[PDB]
Amino acid sequence: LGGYMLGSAMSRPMIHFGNDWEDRYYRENMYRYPNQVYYRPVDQYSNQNNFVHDCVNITIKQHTVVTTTKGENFTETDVKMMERVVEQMCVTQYQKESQAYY
């Protein structure tokens, strides 16, 4: 609570998960995952990995409560996939954040 920022929405990338069943599952379900991230200001982290880790957890936690509010649930596959794409977005956010303030 408090201290968070919301990144701008990002184009959803084509993501390949390495097997036939997951690629299809992802293509069909990817709309259920965030297209923007919540994070704390980049200055508050010792490096990229630290920022990213927290950005991922914060974003997924908040997305999960809003999803629960709608009466929906994430499976273990959902969490694994969401983790991956949110990680990509957090990396992009850090790079942009790191560039600013530098």
Epitope: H16, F17, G18, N19, D20, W21, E22, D23, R84, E87
Partner: antibody
Framework: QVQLQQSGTELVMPGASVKMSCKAS????????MHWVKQRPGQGLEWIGS????????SHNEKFKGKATLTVDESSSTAYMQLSSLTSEDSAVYFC????????????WGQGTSVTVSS | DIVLTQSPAILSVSPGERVSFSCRAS??????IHWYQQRTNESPRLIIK???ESISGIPSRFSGSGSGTDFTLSINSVESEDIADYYC?????????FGGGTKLELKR
């Protein structure tokens, strides 16, 4: 023409680690998954693990998780597998291979790196 | 884990003969089975993908059929260069798994 270049051989001491390279050429490196497959002398193929070069997301055969570390170097279009704490059980040929675009037949194969673990 | 069982483990064949061998999966994998040929001291080579789809530069004598759990690779007319080990592999879900292989040898 797609090529996957692997070193021919590695001689490794028991307990040591080895890092094997697989250098890709002839296509857009980040568009395709790369895979690593083990074959013991006179035995069959065993999947070790695979990597998506776009973000270095990986998947492992459960028994290689903690043993085989997969990375890529996007700038040199090279995939690496590091095997640690080698024993004679690790004496084998290791192939890298590349699948299709959103399809997972292993379309291209390296020539394999033959690893011998011995003191 | 999806277990892939190949049979027979060894097949003796006469040049020119039509041969087939089978790969059976412990669970339904749709058409997510691929076949590889591996000659002595060589890398495997993709021969048929997704049960039945042909591969560029592979002889038309190779074909595959099946969907679900029971798959077959057939060679219309066996040639000496086809003497090799043959493996199936599934890519439907993790972990990838391989059959134990079928070895082709010449009957004499």
């Amino acid at each position: 023409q797609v090529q996957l270049q692997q070193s021919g051989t590695e001689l490794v001491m028991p307990g040591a680690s080895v890092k094997m390279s697989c250098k890709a050429s002839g296509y857009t490196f980040t568009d395709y998954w790369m895979h690593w497959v083990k074959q013991r002398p006179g035995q069959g193929l065993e999947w070790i693990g695979s990597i998506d070069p776009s973000d270095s997301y990986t998947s492992h055969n459960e028994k290689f998780k903690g043993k085989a570390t997969l990375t890529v170097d996007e700038s040199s279009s090279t995939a690496y597998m590091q095997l640690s704490s080698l024993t004679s059980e690790d004496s084998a040929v290791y192939f890298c291979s590349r699948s299709g675009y959103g399809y997972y037949a292993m379309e291209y194969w390296g020539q394999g790196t033959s690893v011998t673990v011995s003191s | 884990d999806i277990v892939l069982t190949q049979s027979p483990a060894i097949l003796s064949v006469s040049p020119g003969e039509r041969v087939s061998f089978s790969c059976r999966a412990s669970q339904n994998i749709g058409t997510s089975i691929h076949w590889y040929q591996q000659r002595t001291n060589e890398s495997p080579r993709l021969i048929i993908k997704y049960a039945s789809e042909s591969i560029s530069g592979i002889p038309s004598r190779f074909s595959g059929s099946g969907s679900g759990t029971d798959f077959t690779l057939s060679i219309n007319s066996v040639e000496s260069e086809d003497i090799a080990d043959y493996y199936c592999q599934q890519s439907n879900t993790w972990p990838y798994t391989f059959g134990g292989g079928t070895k082709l040898e010449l009957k004499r």
